[PDB]
Design a protein around this ligand. Structure first.
Ligand SMILES: [Mg+2]
Ligand SMILES: [Mg+2]
Ligand SMILES: [Mg+2]
Ligand SMILES: [Mg+2]
Ligand SMILES: [Mg+2]
Ligand SMILES: [Mg+2]
Ligand SMILES: [Mg+2]
Ligand SMILES: [Mg+2]
Ligand SMILES: [Mg+2]
Ligand SMILES: [Mg+2]
Ligand SMILES: [Mg+2]
Ligand SMILES: [Mg+2]
Ligand SMILES: [Mg+2]
Ligand SMILES: [Mg+2]
Ligand SMILES: [Mg+2]
Ligand SMILES: [Mg+2]
Ligand SMILES: [Mg+2]
Ligand SMILES: [Mg+2]
Ligand SMILES: [Mg+2]
Ligand SMILES: [Mg+2]
Ligand SMILES: [Mg+2]
Ligand SMILES: [Mg+2]
Ligand SMILES: [Mg+2]
Ligand SMILES: [Mg+2]
Ligand SMILES: [Mg+2]
Ligand SMILES: [Mg+2]
Ligand SMILES: [Mg+2]
Ligand SMILES: [Mg+2]
Ligand SMILES: [Mg+2]
Ligand SMILES: [Mg+2]
Ligand SMILES: [Mg+2]
Ligand SMILES: [Mg+2]
Ligand SMILES: [Mg+2]
Ligand SMILES: [Mg+2]
Ligand SMILES: [Mg+2]
Ligand SMILES: [Mg+2]
Ligand SMILES: [Mg+2]
Ligand SMILES: [Mg+2]
Ligand SMILES: [Mg+2]
Ligand SMILES: [Mg+2]
Ligand SMILES: [Mg+2]
Ligand SMILES: [Mg+2]
Ligand SMILES: [Mg+2]
Ligand SMILES: [Mg+2]
Ligand SMILES: [Mg+2]
Ligand SMILES: [Mg+2]
Ligand SMILES: [Mg+2]
Ligand SMILES: [Mg+2]
Ligand SMILES: [Mg+2]
Ligand SMILES: [Mg+2]
Lengths: 155, 70, 116
RNA sequence: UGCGCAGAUACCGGGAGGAACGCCGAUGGCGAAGGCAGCCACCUGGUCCACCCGUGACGCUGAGGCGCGAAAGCGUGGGGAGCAAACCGGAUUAGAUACCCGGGUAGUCCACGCCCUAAACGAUGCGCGCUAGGUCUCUGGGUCUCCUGGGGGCCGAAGCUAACGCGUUAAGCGCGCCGCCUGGGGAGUACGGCCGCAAGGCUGAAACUCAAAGGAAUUGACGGGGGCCCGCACAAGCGGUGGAGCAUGUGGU
């Protein structure tokens, strides 16, 4: 976007939870344009997390997303020859996409056979502070505070 | 900001021994204020400089000072 | 083993490193730190974060001798010259006064080709 | 590389030594040019203003001569902190006989004697007379919004100029005198001479060779020049190719 701000798309509220954060997550699961497949995966995974754990799948979904949100990341900036890893804050919009993507990516590295089984379990672990999505978040937050010597390059 | 000659009396620019007035022309450091800040004429600045430098040798005016700030 | 409880802290800031010395009121040093005293080795020493830690490393060492009041003396231009000071103010050591004493010649010595 | 446990760097005190003068400092001042910045005293040159006193054309320029002449370099003797040709190393690199980093001799400073070059530039020789102004400034005098000298800048009348530009600080208009130029390369070379301790300087060709060498300005183009702004150009993101097997096209054979 060289000209405009590139306004953000406004997703449709969820059909079940009326929540936009759910619909965006269902999209991240969808592949090859099969949204009916993605929603059935996400919604069946709500049954797994609501039975094997006696809490609201709505609240755990949000609680899992909040724990994967990184507060800081690193970016590369060309300075006097080779560039540097420069730590800087994450836009709240960027914390949205990053956590969701990591949650879906981490759940597919899981052992579980069926998709919804991986999603529910990943969300359960992510909500508890463990799980593969939180590791990526913690490892990124490790990149910051490590190259923190370059905090003068903020840009 | 006011200029040094503006808030001052009728003083001898050639008297190297009057420190109370000559101190007024030095900065927070021992440097001599430029003509913008002294309001003095071209000839008056030439005279002030040598008389200030004179007093610096008698120990009456400092060569350089230390800035208490930043 | 001294208990001076007050003294002076000198900040020497160059573009290649920043180092801090902490002395008693008559000027004799107590403890000191630098960008090399903390882990940093190369051009990282000239970074302000190094100046921040070096200041805090020296501050904590002065705590062991009981330092509370600190008069700050600054010498040199360089990155983290200020960042070294702002680390001293929040180190717990009360900063009594800050003075810039950087030695400037009256054009007495011919500089290296670098500086001409 | 180097320096540091034989205790550096950083910090306080004391001492030694050499070189250069921060601020003031200026787009400023002074000199014939080179050039001249701490302060004090002595010796001393130039220059400018007022008075309208004195001399009474005593003036201008100037081949030769003579004196001066940044830096570097030379001789003798000193001096030597910092910088630093050469050089010793460390890196970089395709290579590094360099740019960058650590060292370091001459030298840079002083005295006395040489050397005589320079983009020694205003690339504009000196003196005098004449030709609109406006503005900034250094320095004198004045009845001191200002007038009047003598310098240093910028715009600009007329005019000049190939053009840029110059324009009472002429590159204008005139006059006097000195120096100097006659296409480029060869060549500031060869020879001879004069000078020099040397390095070299002053003077300064020919054969041969070429149809050019040059100046200013124009439109473009380019910049590892500047500003401003676009495109899935980058970035953010999603799926790919490069691997496998096959289909097809090309290279090669
Ligand atoms: Mg590059
Ligand atoms: Mg360094
Ligand atoms: Mg060693
Ligand atoms: Mg050793
Ligand atoms: Mg000392
Ligand atoms: Mg010595
Ligand atoms: Mg100056
Ligand atoms: Mg002159
Ligand atoms: Mg000159
Ligand atoms: Mg005199
Ligand atoms: Mg005189
Ligand atoms: Mg008369
Ligand atoms: Mg007569
Ligand atoms: Mg004459
Ligand atoms: Mg002659
Ligand atoms: Mg001579
Ligand atoms: Mg000479
Ligand atoms: Mg010389
Ligand atoms: Mg010599
Ligand atoms: Mg050196
Ligand atoms: Mg060197
Ligand atoms: Mg080498
Ligand atoms: Mg090598
Ligand atoms: Mg190369
Ligand atoms: Mg000559
Ligand atoms: Mg002529
Ligand atoms: Mg007057
Ligand atoms: Mg004039
Ligand atoms: Mg003009
Ligand atoms: Mg005309
Ligand atoms: Mg004339
Ligand atoms: Mg002409
Ligand atoms: Mg000639
Ligand atoms: Mg010819
Ligand atoms: Mg010729
Ligand atoms: Mg020659
Ligand atoms: Mg001959
Ligand atoms: Mg000869
Ligand atoms: Mg001879
Ligand atoms: Mg020689
Ligand atoms: Mg020669
Ligand atoms: Mg030419
Ligand atoms: Mg041309
Ligand atoms: Mg045009
Ligand atoms: Mg262009
Ligand atoms: Mg290139
Ligand atoms: Mg570059
Ligand atoms: Mg693209
Ligand atoms: Mg991309
Ligand atoms: Mg293939």
């Amino acid at each position: 976007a060289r000209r405009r701000r590139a306004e953000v798309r406004q997703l449709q509220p969820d059909l079940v939870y009326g929540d936009v954060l759910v619909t965006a997550f269902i999209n991240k699961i969808m592949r090859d344009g099969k949204k009916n497949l993605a929603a059935r995966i996400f919604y069946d995974a709500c049954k797994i997390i609501q039975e094997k754990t006696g809490q609201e799948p709505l609240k755990v979904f949000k609680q899992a997303v909040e724990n994967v949100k990184p507060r800081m990341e690193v970016r590369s900036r060309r300075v006097g020859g080779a560039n540097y890893q420069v730590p800087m804050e994450v836009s709240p919009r960027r914390q949205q996409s990053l956590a969701l993507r990591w949650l879906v990516q981490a759940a597919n590295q899981r052992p579980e056979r069926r998709a919804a089984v991986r999603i529910a379990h990943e969300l359960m672990d992510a909500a508890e502070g463990k799980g593969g999505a939180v590791k990526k978040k913690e490892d990124v937050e490790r990149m910051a505070e490590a190259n923190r010597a370059y905090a003068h390059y903020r840009w | 900001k006011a200029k040094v000659k503006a808030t001052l009396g009728e003083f001898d620019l050639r008297d190297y021994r009057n420190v109370e007035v000559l101190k007024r022309f030095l900065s927070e450091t021992g440097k001599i204020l430029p003509r913008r800040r002294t309001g003095l004429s071209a000839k008056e600045q030439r005279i002030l400089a040598k008389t200030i430098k004179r007093a610096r040798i008698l120990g009456l005016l400092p060569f350089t000072e230390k800035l208490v700030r930043k | 083993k001294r208990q001076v409880a007050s003294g002076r802290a000198y900040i020497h800031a160059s573009y290649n490193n920043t180092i801090v010395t902490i002395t008693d009121p008559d000027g004799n040093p107590i403890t000191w730190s630098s960008g090399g005293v903390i882990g940093y080795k190369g051009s990282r020493k000239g970074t302000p974060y190094a100046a921040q830690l070096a200041a805090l490393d020296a501050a904590k060492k002065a705590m062991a001798y009981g330092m509370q009041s600190v008069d700050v003396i600054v010498r040199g231009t360089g990155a983290g010259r200020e960042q070294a000071i702002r680390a001293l103010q929040a180190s717990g050591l009360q900063v009594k006064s800050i003075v810039d004493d950087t030695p400037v010649p009256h054009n007495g010595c011919r500089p290296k080709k670098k500086f001409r």
